Amino acid sequence: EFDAIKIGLASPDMIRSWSFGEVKKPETINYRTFKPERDGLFCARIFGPVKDYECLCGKYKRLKHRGVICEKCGVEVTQTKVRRDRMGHIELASPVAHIWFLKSLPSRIGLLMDMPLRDIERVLYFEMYVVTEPGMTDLERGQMLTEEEYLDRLEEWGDEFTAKMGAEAIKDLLASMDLPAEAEQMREELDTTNSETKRKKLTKRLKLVEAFVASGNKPEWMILTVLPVLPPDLRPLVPLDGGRFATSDLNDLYRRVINRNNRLKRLLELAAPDIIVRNEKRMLQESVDALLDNGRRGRAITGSNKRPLKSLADMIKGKQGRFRQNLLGKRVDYSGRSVITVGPYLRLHQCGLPKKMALELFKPFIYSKLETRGLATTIKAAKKMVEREEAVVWDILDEVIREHPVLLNRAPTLHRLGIQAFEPVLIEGKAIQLHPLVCAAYNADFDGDQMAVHVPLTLEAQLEARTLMMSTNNILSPASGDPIIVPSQDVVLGLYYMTREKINAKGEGMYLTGPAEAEKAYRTKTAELHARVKVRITETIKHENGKLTTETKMIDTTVGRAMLWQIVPKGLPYSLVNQKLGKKQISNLLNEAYRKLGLKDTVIFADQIMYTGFAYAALSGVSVGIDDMVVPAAKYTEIAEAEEEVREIQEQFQSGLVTAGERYNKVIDIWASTNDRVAKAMMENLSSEQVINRQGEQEKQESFNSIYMMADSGARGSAAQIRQLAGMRGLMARPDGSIIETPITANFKEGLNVLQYFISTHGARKGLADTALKTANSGYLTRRLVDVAQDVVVTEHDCGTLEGVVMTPHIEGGDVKVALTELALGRVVSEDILKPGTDEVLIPRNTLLDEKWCKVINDNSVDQIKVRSVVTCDSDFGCCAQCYGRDLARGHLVNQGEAVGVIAAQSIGEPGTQLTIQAKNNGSVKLHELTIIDEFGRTKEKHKLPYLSKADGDAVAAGETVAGGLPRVADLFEARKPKEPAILAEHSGTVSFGKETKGKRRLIITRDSGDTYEEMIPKHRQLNVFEGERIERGDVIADGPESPHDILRLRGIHAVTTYIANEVQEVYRLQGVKINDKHIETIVRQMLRKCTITFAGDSEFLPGETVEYSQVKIANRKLVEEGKEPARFERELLGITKASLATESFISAASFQETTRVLTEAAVSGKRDDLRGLKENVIVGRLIPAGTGFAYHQDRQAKRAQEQQ
Template sequence: MRENIKCNKTFDKKEIRSLIEWFLNNYGGIRTIKLLDKLKALGFKQASIAGISLGIDDLKIPETKKILFKNTEKDLNKIEIKAKNGRINSLNRLDKITETWNRTNELLKDEVIKNLRQTDLLNPVYMMTFSGARGNISQIKQLIGMRGLMSDSQGEIINLPIKSNLKEGLKIPEYFISCYGARKGLVDTAIKTANSGYLTRRLIYAAQSLIVKKNDCKSKYNKLLLSLKKDKKYYKILQEKILGRVIARDIYDKRKNKVIASAGQDICQYTLKRISIYKKIYIRSPLTCKLNTGICQLCYGWNLANGRMVELGESIGILAAQSIGEPGTQLTMRTFHTGGVFAGEVAETIIAPHSGNIKYNSFSKGREIETKYREKAFFTLEEKKLTITDGKTQKSVIYIPCYSIIFSKNNEEVSNRQILAQLCDWQELKGKKKKKELREIKEIKTKISGQVYFDTINKKEENGIIWIINGNILTNKILYKNRIKKNYIIKHIFLETKNENYKQINIINNDSKTQRIQKNYLSHKELKKLKEFNIDNKLKSKIYCVNKVTNRKKEFLTNKKLLTKSLKIRENLPKIGEFVYKNKIIGRRFVNKYPLQVIEIKKDHLKVQKANPTTISKNCQINIKNNSLTKKNKTIFYTHHQKQKTEDIVQGLPKIEELLEAKKTSNFRSISNNPHEKLKKLFTCFEKKYSNEIAVRKSIDRIQKLLVEKIQSVYKTQGVNICDKHMEIIIKQMTSKVIILEAGDSNLINGETIEINKIEKINYKLETKVKYEPIIIGISKISLSNQSFISEASFQETTSVLTKSAIEGKIDWLCGLKENLILGNLIPVGTGYKMQKTL
């Protein structure tokens, strides 16, 4: 007798699922039912004994929250200094704020889990969440961590994070910010669930007639899968793709000189382990099934419900439509529960376990780099050992993997929970893996008014700085009445006390070589008008400089303040006209609080004026001219900016619909590289090399693969796994027809659409072959171009469908489910021997 197998480990939802799957594969369905009954009884019994309840004291806030916030504020202060110095522009600053708070939120989530795990394993909150029974970590994070960044009604991020959690309670501004997310959740639950339901309905109508009709269609076409990697993650992906499929070509081992797996064999767990080491695996797919109506057993493979070969009469079209539509409905509900909290990708980081001195070999493989936020870091090309020592009490050793960015310098003091390094994806670095970016054109505006100054700027590199020299812009007609003509520059406006009614303005003629001073007087009434432009007639010592006169716009630039900085030691002084950044020591006497431009250097003092720098982005479009005047909030340049949006199904559903409907336009704009354009390009390319039939098949194969990948990528971002098989059935319907270009010897008409399998069979018997081109049809159009006019009429456009069918004298052969259901007949599906005989 076999001994009882003992498993001394925690069985959460995932482990129980694996146990049931293993038991089903090894012991069959009848014994599995008995096991499930026993598990159910055990669960109810233990739940009753435990009597788990939830109280406010069970929500334990980690003490490290304050430390993480302190480190975050320190990082953000550095970014603010960089932004004021013009090292990064406003968009990069906002991105950094978002990235930093999002990373802090993730680190705090890890601290919450760590705190619960280390202090109280029997905490009801911990048990409920991590067993998979109730709730998820996103909700627990909001209860005892921080709510974090919120998204608004459009899904874009509000850059002010909610630092409080729900146990601590929200402050008034935080409450109002969180209202955006709450409202979004309610709206999404109401509206988007209906959209998801309509998508499911269209999918059902598109695929309802797909039934397993025959054992084998004898298709010569197949699907190729490449098995290049041998790591655990890729093996799992490969397992999902090919488990339960049928092998199309023999897999031959050249070394052992024998067949490992033969064509027509289904792939089980045992076969998968043997064939996963080979690079090329050819499998049968519903996409290439040759039957005119329905799909054959071998092209479909296993019925995923029971792990056996699909039986004849199985309604696989309905099954596929439900598998794709159902997660959409579920995920729209989930947005309500999370409450509009921002969820985006965060790079994996390594933090210091305690404060101390950090040491590592900085002369090994790697190089010093500068991030897009102008942060100096070390990029390592090999695994690196980091040692953190805090006197004699604590010592920690951390191993940093290769292709990581280390932010801390060698022999530097680091604080507790400080970010030491960030892990990078090597495929992204090498350009093999392209990061999906949603880009839009953004405008950068100036915060102050003044004169524009910039050197020669290279638009392809991020190295140019545009300076705005602070000043007021005057547009006053009075100055023009007083004989101030073209190219005259007002150097000083000052007061004289001799005459109370008139004030003198000295004007220098800039055109003539010998500069001539022309005196103009303004009356007391005119001075009142000038007061509106910050000209003060009380303070005698105040000096106003006018740098530029623009005749067309009639604009004058006046500087409010010229600052004087006293000097004691004349070392490392800047030159006249040079710009000085914030926090730079001048003459070892003072640290300037903001960026400046030096105007005059004397023995004991330095004259400076305020300036505002902005770094230009790569490939930007500059909107202003050098030395021109600009007003506050005027656009300096336009730049391409990567949009950050919360990744939820509300953004995903329109994308899925766009792909399944094969849309050419969206919001009155044509979609670039839409499937129709891609298919046309592929076909014209293949037509030059191959015959018409092969060119059509190859181009359809490429576009089918692309559509499967794109739809799957949307669901995978939500953590939803849908078998490729279900996608392939819907996409088969979308790509199953072609349009006739030249009729040849057939009775077909140019421009007519026909199934690809039918036309290939017709062409086989003709001397002059029919020429045709592949097309993609959206799921709504498929439902309205069905063989059955009864099914079409029950979907939409009932009057036009019935009228058209009556004029054409159409016959409905009652092949599908819908038409038989409407007439009250038995539907042509069902499994077993009798069904096999009927088919």
């Protein structure tokens, strides 16, 4: 229907064209008949009838008279919904300035007229004059005159000049302006200007003037003469129960405006004294400003609630505004909500749904099937049968929901795994039954949690739920690629208990034919689950090439391990099950099953694992008791020793040998050491036991303590919590953060006293409050990331670019932090991976690096590779499939139309709640910094080189001595400037001292061409440079935090990308959160979307102008094809908020935040919204250009071009 949204200024003729009449009276409804009043805010002659196909008279009261205007009233006989579309207008007695174009900084009227806002307000506030036509007088246009001065020059010259007050003066000045003449004069002045501030001022004014000329808008339209009036049904006055009426504040504001306008007209009819007329005009201006934007001009007008009235700007803007409350998010039909329970019998794609709840949700389908089979003749009969709840209705409901997917969603939806598709199963109850394995996906526990359900209606939606959103497809985490359906708690505990080993168990040493005989022995009470036996295992390996090799051999194992192998699918080794299975082992089993067998086998294996774990956790009988918490006997001795030497050092303090701070420090140190010793003793006492073996001797066995088993299996608990239960609680902090000297020397088994409990509450309250605030911080950060990256969609397959980023193992000392395999998993090779010291192409170009090639690289021992990245992509809009790589949630190359930006933003923002020189290897030494490289050719040590035992290339043996998170991520993504940034070498040359100017110092640098560049530096700076040294570009002069803008300007795109990725990943890896770097590079690419033009060239770009990089790239390509001088640009780094607000589309910018500024800029410029992103299509209700809509949108674009031909 429509392809673009055009915004701009509204002319009075256009406003009259919109309006269906003029509102002349502030009347709303009669107080007796409750009927609209003529020429009022609710007039039926202007806005439409209040009853369908009726008139206020009642003479025309049926449909035969449609479109006929009653002669007695004037009300057109039509539908009432026209009252939601029909507009009105008010003919204002005097012009009023638009508040948005006057007080939204920068003031557009002041910018256009080159006058300060204060002077314009003084003219508007009726204080001092302004000259409109100077005439044949020394007076100049736009200069300000006091009343006394006005009288003097009026007695002097008389009618030769015209000087006015108010918005009439501003409109008579704006209309007298010649935009082309001003543009030419300011172009000439900018050509012969030198000052930078003046350059900025007139370049802004020139941009505004050229925008006005290009858009076709007139400046005088910024002063309102005709005021449009909203449809009554959008500002309704409707009766409540009990005779009360509910009204909108817009009615009060409109009534005020109409009353003041009518009073002004009456005063002008009476030939009023001037002062009263000026007061009335001020009141009219104030009323119009309050109606448009209340509180911006001055004191906000309040009603009878002592609370400010809500205006149109408040109605369209804010968190509670239309954009965020009704356009980007809506309340929907065919939805429900219920508490969630656990269904251990369900399959991974099944969810338990109440029968009544499904009956209410699927009611139209039940009607359709009740008529199709002839059980109900008409829809009323079907409704009656559904209401009476007959058995055939239940059968119809069962047939309806058979293969109909349903959507389950839990708030908050941090990532896309928070909404999934399941097959409903009717259950007797009122609570939704949920599969346990999806709980980690939902972050849901059964302590009162509620989940919402949605019913996809169309066939397309059902197939989308079945194919994309089904739980069986979403078993890999899109943030990392690791499995997300890993077992936890009871399943892990059962698999751990069954796979444990016991010494001298019943049935030890027996020989079993296989898992079936092991199960038979277990059920017959012949052998225990933990008896060491020898089992004949038939084991099949599916190799990388697809070879299926079956080997039958006898393996030493336990009965439980074979019984668990009974459910392991074919194609996996027995070594995965021939061990005690914690959370890590089961996760590895599931990952191997996915990587070697597929998805269906993985789903069945996960279901069987959950069933077996639940069953054998039930059969285990694991229980927590007061005897399971064994406090070590060494704890009391250690406490006594610590207290004694505390007494000794207190005596030392009374002697003056040490200060109070040293005493505090060593008391804290000893208390930490004693806590560590007590924890070690308790862990040793809890982890082991002595048993009698077959020979009769005493053997060492791992303990079967319930708490120890819970902690070791990884189901629930850790070493720290066991330490608090059976050891020491440790030192705690004061509310400010300082650590109390005396720690809690008691655990929870013995019990704390009053003081220790109070100290514990000190930190518990801090933790709870920190969680509460960090949740909101993470939500805001995620929203900003989504709004900055929502436009990134995979649009092509290959962009044909040779650029890429270099990838090496991440080294932070003598050990590797992350391997090259982890970073290269799923990336496309940019240049061929040659074998070290050889010219053989091991891995060719444009090949995805999967597990096989990762193993190949690890075996070959390749150190540095180059891969394609989203930041270096050449795609005009979005990115291409190859530059992105494997999609972590699916395992293959990313498909066309994937909204990778939203996935990246969600992946980064979801863990926000969790967020708060001696050589050690044998090899050679290489200098660039200090690097130690092994004999295989891998760099295994990286260390800094402050300004040595071995020289470059000298072999070094082992042991030789050569000699806070979430705010950090927020500032990193916002490109925040550090308070004390590091001074960086702007240009390459030799350093030279200069005049030590008072206040702060100056320095100079001599380039290769002899040009001297001056640098301004503060006094308090520990300089690293020395005179006579040629410092390279990007060398550090003053140490400190590095500004990302400086890194981008002086090092390049790759350097800033690496810096941001490394810092964000350091913050995340400190907490143990695994997030792929392509997400952070999809955010960094969005940051680097603007360029400032340095060389204008012949393209339509001005120097000092910030424009989009893609447009400049296309313009440069066109100019090169035309053989004309191309443009030169300097890429700019913007934060996520500024990049979000600097988008080409104004709908998305207005929907994000600061609607007033965005709308004002779009209106003055006359911007056009092409609806190319997700948010615009969501707001206008069209298909998003991502996924299943992608092809659709593509088709339209083709037709566009084909028609434009």
